Design a binder for this molecule. Structure first.
Ligand SMILES: [Mg+2]
Ligand SMILES: [Zn+2]
Lengths: 81, 87, 155, 129, 184, 151
RNA sequence: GUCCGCGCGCACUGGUUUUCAACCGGAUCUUUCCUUCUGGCUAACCUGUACUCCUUGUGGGUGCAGGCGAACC
C-alpha cells in the first residue's frame, strides 16, 4: 500500500470489490434475451428477476424466485444482451 | 532559520525521508541511508559513485519500506517493472 | 371586522367630522375619508370600499404610524380586531461566543381591511398607544397564502 | 449522519497523512471541499488531485507530497470579526510566520492572510499548517 | 427553399450548407419522408489547430432527437461534400443568468437552464455517436482546471479522428480545456 | 446502514447506473412504456410494483430514464395518484394487522412493543407528508380511521 | 539628481510601458445586466446640420428637432 492509483486500478480490483465501493458503482446484474422452448417469441429478462416472468404468449415460466439470480426452466436459451 | 542580513542561522539543515518526504529527526534510530553503487555497461561497479535513499524510521516500523524502495528503484530507472503504480 | 355591521353596537359608528348631508341630491353612500400612512405603503382597496369604521385604523382611523416598523409571524388571531405576533430572533451570548433562539410576543391592532390567519408574516408599524398592551398596527400582510394559493389537484 | 462533510474530508486527509500515505479518497466531495483543497494547493500544502463525478455528490482523490503536517476543521462556524482573527491565529497556528486559518469571506473561502489584505472577514472554516 | 428552413438568412455559408442539405433531400427513399420539416439556427465556424475548421449547426431544441436519429449519415455526407471541415450538431441553448440576491425575482428559473447543466448537455451532444461514460476533473498545481472525459471503447470508430476537433470546439465555446480518453 | 429502529447496519441497496440516457439495446419507445405503466396502474399496482414488473417482464431498466419522468409523477400527471402514498399505505396495513393480532391475544408483549415502534414510524412519515402538503393537514391515525383507510 | 558613512546598494527628491510580481479593484464581451421604468436634464457625443473658427490632415469649436441616460434627480 501507501502508493496507489485509486483512479486507474486493475480490472481485477474492479471485479473483486463489492459494488458501491468501485470508483463508480454499476450494478453487477444485467439483462438477457431468452428464448422459450415452446414459442419462438424472444423475451427480455432481468438477471435477478423477482416475479416469475411467463411469456405473454403462453403460460410457460422462464425464471423462478430466488434470493439471488432467478433459476430458469432448464430448457430455455439465454444470451447476455 | 534565516536572518535579515543574509545568513543561515538555522543549524544542520536536516534530511527528509525519500519515501514519505517526511523529516528525519536527529535521533531517529531507525532511519537507514541505503546506497546503491552505479554500474557501467560491461558490469563493473563504479567506485566512489552511487545513489542514495534515506528511508524513514516510521515506514520501516510499519513494514512497508520494501514496497517504497521498489517504487524509488522503479521511478529512477534502477529496476524494470518490479513495482506497478496500479494495484 | 365587526362582520360588516359596525352599526351593531349600542352606539353609532362613524368617522368624526365626516358626513353626508341628506339635503344633497347626489347620493354617494357615505363620505369615507382615508389616508396613506407613508413609507411607501399601499393602502388596500377594501379599505376605501369598506364600511367599517375602526377609529384605530391606520387609514380610515385617527391613529398614525411613525417610528419603529417590525416584521413578524402571526401566531394568534382569536381576539377581536387585534392580533398576537410572534417575533423570533437570536441573542448573542458572548461568554460562549454563541447564539440562542429567543422570541417575543407583540400584540397589534389589525384593521378590518386585512384578512389575517395564523401562519402569515405581517409587517406591522408603531403607533400611538391603542390599549394596555398593544402599540403596533398592521401595515402589510405579505405571506398571505404561501402554499394556500393552490389547494386542489385536477390534471 | 455526516453532519460536516468538510470535517470528514479533513479527517481522512489527516489520518492518511499521519499514516504516511501519498493518496487519499474523500467520499462525499462538496464544492466547499473543492475550494478548501484548492486553497491548500495554491499554497502548496498538497499536490495534484482529482474530482470523480458519480452523478451523486461526486468523489475526490488527492495526491499528497508529505508537506502537510496537520489539518483540521472548526466545525461550529463561528462568526469572527476582522478584530478577532488575530485571537484565532494565536489559538490555532503554531506561529505567525506561516499557517493559515481558512475562513469564508464575502469574496469566498480564503486564507486569513488574504482576508487581512482584502480587509474582509466572515465565518471560519478550519486551519492548515 | 433556402431561407425557409433557416429561420433567417445572414452568413451565406449556412445558405450553402442548406443548399447541400437540399441536394441531399434529393435522396428520397431513405433520407426523406421525414427530413423536410427541419430548421437551423445560424450555423457557424470555429478555427481548429492544424489548419482545420469545425462547423457547428445549432438545433432550435424542437425535437433534437429527430436530428440525432439521422445524424450519423447526414454528418458523413456533409463531411464528404465539405472538405477540410469537420461538422458537428449542437443544441442551441438559451442559458439563463444566476439570480443575484439583489436582483428581481423572476418565477424561479428551472435547474435545466443553469450554466453547468447546459455545459453538461452540450458536452454530451457534442459527440452523439459515442456515449459519455466518465468524467474526471483535475486541478494542476498552477490552479487551472482540466477535464478528462471517458468515452466508451465500443462505438469509438464513428469518430476515431475527431477528438482534437471537439477539444478545440469546447475550448473556444466555454474555455474549459478538455483532454479526451478511452478505456483500453 | 442506519436502521432507525435496530442496531443493525445493513446497507443492502441498488446501484443506479452511470448512464443517464437510455441503454442502447432498448427497443421500445417512451410513449409505449408510458401507456404500459398507465395500464398496470389501472390494473391496481402500486408504483413500486409497476417498476418491478417493468424491470422483470420487459426491457425497462428504470422508467425514469426511459419515460423521462418518475413513476409517481407519471401517475399523478394522469390522475392515478393514490390518495394515500404507497409506503404509508403499507405501513397502515402492517399497523392494523398487528392491532388485530393483539386484539386476538393479549400477552404477546413483543408484538405490543413492535406495534408502538410502528406507531412511531407512521407518525414520522405522516408528519413529513403533512409538512410537504401532499396530505391534508387534519390527517391523524388513532383507532378506527386506520381500518377505514384499510377497508 | 542630491549626496552620506572601500562602501550601505541611493540614506532625500522621480521617470517608471526596460520587462516586470502583483494584490485590491473598476469597466468591459461571453449564449453572462448594473432592480426597472416614467419624465425631468439629458450629463454628454451614435447625433446630423448651417459650418469650418482652428496649417490641406476630425489635433477642435459657433450649435440645435430624431437620439447614450448613469454625470444626477
Ligand atoms: Mg450541507
Ligand atoms: Zn413460452
Amino acid at each position: 500500500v501507501l502508493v496507489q492509483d485509486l483512479l486507474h486500478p486493475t480490472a481485477a480490483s474492479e471485479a473483486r470489490k463489492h459494488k458501491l465501493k468501485t470508483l463508480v458503482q454499476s450494478p453487477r446484474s444485467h439483462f438477457l434475451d431468452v428464448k422459450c422452448p415452446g414459442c419462438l417469441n424472444i423475451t427480455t429478462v432481468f438477471s435477478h428477476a423477482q416475479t416469475a416472468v411467463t411469456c405473454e404468449s403462453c403460460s410457460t415460466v422462464l425464471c423462478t424466485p430466488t434470493g439471488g439470480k432467478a433459476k430458469l426452466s432448464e430448457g430455455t436459451s439465454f444470451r447476455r444482451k | 532559520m534565516e536572518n535579515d542580513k543574509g545568513q543561515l542561522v538555522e543549524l544542520y539543515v536536516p534530511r527528509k525521508c525519500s519515501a514519505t518526504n517526511r523529516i528525519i529527526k536527529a535521533k531517529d534510530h531507525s532511519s537507514v541511508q541505503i546506497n546503491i553503487a552505479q554500474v557501467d555497461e560491461e558490469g563493473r561497479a563504479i567506485p566512489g559513485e552511487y545513489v542514495t535513499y534515506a528511508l524513514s524510521g516510521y515506514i520501516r516500523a510499519r513494514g512497508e519500506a520494501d514496497d517504497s524502495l521498489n517504487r524509488l528503484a522503479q521511478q529512477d530507472g534502477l529496476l524494470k517493472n518490479v513495482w506497478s503504480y496500479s494495484r | 371586522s365587526t362582520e360588516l355591521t359596525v352599526q351593531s353596537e349600542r352606539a353609532f359608528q362613524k368617522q368624526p367630522h365626516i358626513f353626508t348631508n341628506p339635503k344633497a341630491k347626489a347620493n354617494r353612500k357615505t363620505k369615507r375619508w382615508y389616508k396613506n400612512v407613508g413609507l411607501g405603503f399601499k393602502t388596500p382597496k377594501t379599505a376605501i370600499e369598506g364600511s367599517y369604521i375602526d377609529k384605530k385604523c391606520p387609514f380610515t382611523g385617527l391613529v398614525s404610524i411613525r417610528g419603529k416598523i417590525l416584521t413578524g409571524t402571526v401566531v394568534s388571531t382569536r381576539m377581536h380586531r387585534t392580533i398576537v405576533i410572534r417575533r423570533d430572533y437570536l441573542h448573542y451570548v458572548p461568554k460562549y461566543n454563541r447564539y440562542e433562539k429567543r422570541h417575543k410576543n407583540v400584540p397589534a391592532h389589525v384593521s378590518p381591511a386585512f384578512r389575517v390567519q395564523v401562519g402569515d408574516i405581517v409587517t406591522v408599524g408603531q403607533c400611538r398607544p391603542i390599549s394596555k398592551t398593544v402599540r403596533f398596527n398592521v401595515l402589510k400582510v405579505a405571506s398571505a397564502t404561501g402554499k394556500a394559493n393552490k389547494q386542489f389537484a385536477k390534471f | 449522519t455526516r453532519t460536516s462533510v468538510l470535517a470528514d474530508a479533513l479527517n481522512a486527509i489527516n489520518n492518511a497523512e499521519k499514516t504516511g500515505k501519498r493518496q487519499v479518497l474523500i467520499r462525499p466531495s462538496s464544492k466547499v471541499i473543492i475550494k478548501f483543497l484548492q486553497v491548500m494547493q495554491k499554497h502548496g500544502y498538497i499536490g495534484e488531485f482529482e474530482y470523480i463525478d458519480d452523478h451523486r455528490s461526486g468523489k475526490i482523490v488527492v495526491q499528497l507530497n508529505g508537506r502537510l503536517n496537520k489539518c483540521g476543521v472548526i466545525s461550529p462556524r463561528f462568526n469572527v470579526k476582522i478584530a478577532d482573527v488575530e485571537k484565532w491565529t494565536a489559538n490555532l497556528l503554531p506561529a505567525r510566520q506561516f499557517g493559515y486559518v481558512i475562513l469564508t469571506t464575502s469574496a469566498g473561502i480564503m486564507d486569513h492572510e488574504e482576508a487581512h489584505r482584502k480587509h474582509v472577514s466572515g465565518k471560519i472554516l478550519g486551519f492548515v499548517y | 427553399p433556402q431561407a425557409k428552413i433557416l429561420s433567417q438568412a445572414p452568413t451565406e455559408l449556412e445558405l450553402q450548407v442548406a443548399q447541400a442539405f437540399i441536394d441531399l433531400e434529393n435522396n428520397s427513399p431513405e433520407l426523406k419522408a421525414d427530413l423536410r420539416a427541419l430548421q437551423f439556427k445560424s450555423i457557424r465556424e470555429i478555427e481548429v489547430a492544424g489548419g482545420k475548421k469545425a462547423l457547428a449547426v445549432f438545433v432550435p431544441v424542437p425535437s433534437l432527437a429527430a436530428y440525432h436519429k439521422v445524424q450519423i449519415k447526414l454528418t458523413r455526407e456533409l463531411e464528404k461534400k465539405f472538405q477540410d471541415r469537420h461538422v458537428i450538431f449542437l443544441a442551441e441553448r438559451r442559458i439563463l443568468p444566476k439570480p443575484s440576491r439583489k436582483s428581481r425575482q423572476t418565477q424561479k428559473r428551472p435547474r435545466s437552464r443553469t450554466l453547468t447543466a447546459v455545459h453538461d448537455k452540450i458536452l454530451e451532444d457534442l459527440v452523439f455517436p459515442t456515449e459519455i461514460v466518465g468524467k474526471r476533473v483535475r486541478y494542476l498545481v498552477g490552479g487551472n482546471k482540466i477535464q478528462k472525459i471517458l468515452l466508451n471503447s465500443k462505438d469509438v470508430q464513428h469518430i476515431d479522428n475527431k477528438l482534437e476537433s471537439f477539444q478545440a470546439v469546447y475550448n473556444k465555446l466555454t474555455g474549459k480545456q478538455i483532454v479526451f480518453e478511452i478505456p483500453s | 446502514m442506519g436502521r432507525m429502529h435496530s442496531k443493525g447496519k445493513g446497507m443492502s441497496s441498488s446501484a443506479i447506473p452511470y448512464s443517464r440516457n437510455a441503454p442502447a439495446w432498448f427497443k421500445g419507445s417512451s410513449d409505449g412504456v408510458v401507456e404500459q405503466i398507465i395500464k398496470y396502474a389501472r390494473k391496481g399496482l402500486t408504483p413500486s410494483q409497476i417498476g418491478v414488473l417493468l424491470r422483470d417482464a420487459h426491457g425497462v431498466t428504470q422508467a425514469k430514464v426511459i419515460t423521462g419522468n418518475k413513476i409517481l409523477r407519471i401517475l399523478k400527471s394522469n390522475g392515478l395518484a393514490p390518495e394515500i402514498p404507497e409506503d404509508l399505505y403499507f405501513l397502515i396495513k402492517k399497523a392494523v394487522s398487528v392491532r388485530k393480532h393483539l386484539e386476538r391475544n393479549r400477552k404477546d408483549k413483543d408484538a405490543k412493543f413492535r406495534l408502538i415502534l410502528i406507531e412511531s414510524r407512521i407518525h414520522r412519515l405522516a408528519r413529513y407528508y403533512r409538512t410537504v402538503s401532499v396530505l391534508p393537514p387534519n390527517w391523524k391515525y388513532e383507532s378506527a380511521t386506520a381500518s377505514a383507510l384499510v377497508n
